[PDB]
């Protein structure tokens, strides 16, 4: 049981130790392509790169590199593309990936500016009348509408492949109150947001994997994916006890390094999954409670 283990680690005050053990056991694969001199300016962080085996390849001959990893959870049967928050020069690559991978949703877990620094380019239009055109990948992006809430915003964009003139609806889920190297204000705020993403259909298997990103694409992004996969696993079996959170996280780290970044985010993951299990195990009323508790209005 994850809940018993939680209170065992909490009483013995050893989350740091548990987290470091995961760091010590985590997979280590080469990131040769990411470290090529020509891709120096395609990486936001020198120490955060995609493994070659799970990296997302852009469908072009020039340079097919982008700092993004395909987290393919086999047993859970859901995939996510964990990526860099995009740079001024890679916004075109970012949407190229979204188009080629057939994603329907983009989950942004950071703010463009955090602690005085620009953690991410402005890679989507903030105003309907001001559409963006990414000349390097031949794509146009238009803000169609947006539903602003207390701590997250949901944007409808239209992505058009200018080459074929085909268009697609991309849903943008922006969490604006998740501090970097930090955790949500409560498991309710988080679960409420996670459920807005789920309800949108964006995570459905009929779509390409959902794109998830904070700034480095591993701290907050990892925390979000871990909670989701863990809920989906126990959901498939309707058995909360058959889910090993640390084991699931290690598994995720086979596809991208550094997933979840502090011991507190790991602790929060447990907390969110434990709270979310109530819904999965058939108490539907908690959903309305998380919404109340989150104060999205
Ligand atoms: O998303 C988070 O929780 C934190 O994300 C972040 C950063 C940020 O957003 O400023 S920097 C960062 C990082 C950590 C270790 C490194 O060697 C290089 C970069 C991570 Br990881």
Short structural description:
The chain has 297 residues and is of the alpha/beta class. It has helices spanning 2-11, 15-25, 91-100, 187-199, 220-237, 245-252, 263-280, 285-294, and strands at residues 68-73, 78-83, 105-108, 113-114, 117-118, 132-134, 139-148, 152-161, 166-175, 210-213. It has a single domain, classed as Protein tyrosine phosphatase superfamily (Protein-Tyrosine Phosphatase, Chain A, Alpha-Beta Complex).
Give a description of the structure:
The protein has a single domain, classed as Protein-Tyrosine Phosphatase, Chain A (Alpha-Beta Complex), CATH 3.90.190.10. Helices cover 33% and strands 19% of the residues. It has helices spanning 2-11, 15-25, 91-100, 187-199, 220-237, 245-252, 263-280, 285-294, and strands spanning 68-73, 78-83, 105-108, 113-114, 117-118, 132-134, 139-148, 152-161, 166-175, 210-213. The strands form 2 sheets. It has an 8-stranded mixed β-sheet with strand order 1-2-10-3-9-8-7-6, with helices on both faces. The protein is globular, with a radius of gyration of 19 Å. Residues 45, 47-48, 119, 180-181, 214-216, 218-220, 258, 261 line the site of the ligand O=C(O)COc1c(C(=O)O)sc(-c2ccc(O)cc2)c1Br. It is classed as hydrolase. The entry lists the keywords Protein-drug complex, hydrolase. The assembly is monomeric. Crystal structure of PTP1B with monocyclic thiophene inhibitor.
């Amino acid at each position: 049981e994850m809940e018993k283990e939680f209170e065992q680690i909490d009483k013995s005050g050893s989350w740091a130790a548990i987290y470091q053990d995961i760091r010590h056991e985590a997979s280590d694969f080469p990131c040769r392509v990411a470290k090529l001199p020509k891709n120096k300016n395609r990486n936001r962080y020198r120490d955060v790169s995609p493994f070659d085996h799970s990296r997302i390849k852009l469908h072009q001959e020039d340079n097919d590199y982008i700092n993004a990893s395909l987290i393919k959870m086999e047993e859970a049967q859901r995939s996510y593309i964990l990526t860099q928050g995009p740079l001024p020069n890679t916004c075109g690559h970012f949407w190229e990936m979204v188009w080629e991978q057939k994603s329907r949703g983009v989950v942004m877990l950071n703010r463009v500016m955090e602690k005085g620094s620009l953690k991410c380019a402005q890679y989507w239009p903030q105003k309907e009348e001001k559409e963006m055109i990414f000349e390097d990948t031949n794509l146009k992006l238009t803000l169609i509408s947006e539903d602003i809430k207390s701590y997250y915003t949901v944007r409808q964009l239209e992505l058009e492949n200018l080459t074929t003139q085909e268009t697609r609806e991309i849903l943008h889920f922006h969490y604006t109150t998740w501090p970097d190297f930090g955790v949500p204000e409560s498991p309710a705020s988080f679960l409420n947001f996670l459920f807005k993403v789920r309800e949108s259909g964006s995570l459905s298997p009929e779509h390409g994997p959902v794109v998830v990103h904070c700034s480095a694409g591993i701290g907050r992004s990892g925390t979000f994916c871990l909670a989701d996969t863990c809920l989906l696993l126990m959901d498939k079996r309707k058995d909360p006890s058959s889910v090993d959170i640390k084991k699931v996280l290690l598994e995720m780290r086979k596809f991208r390094m550094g997933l979840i970044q502090t011991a507190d985010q790991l602790r929060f993951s447990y907390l969110a999954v434990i709270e979310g299990a109530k819904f999965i195990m058939g108490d539907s009323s908690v959903q309305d409670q998380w919404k109340e508790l989150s104060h999205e209005d």
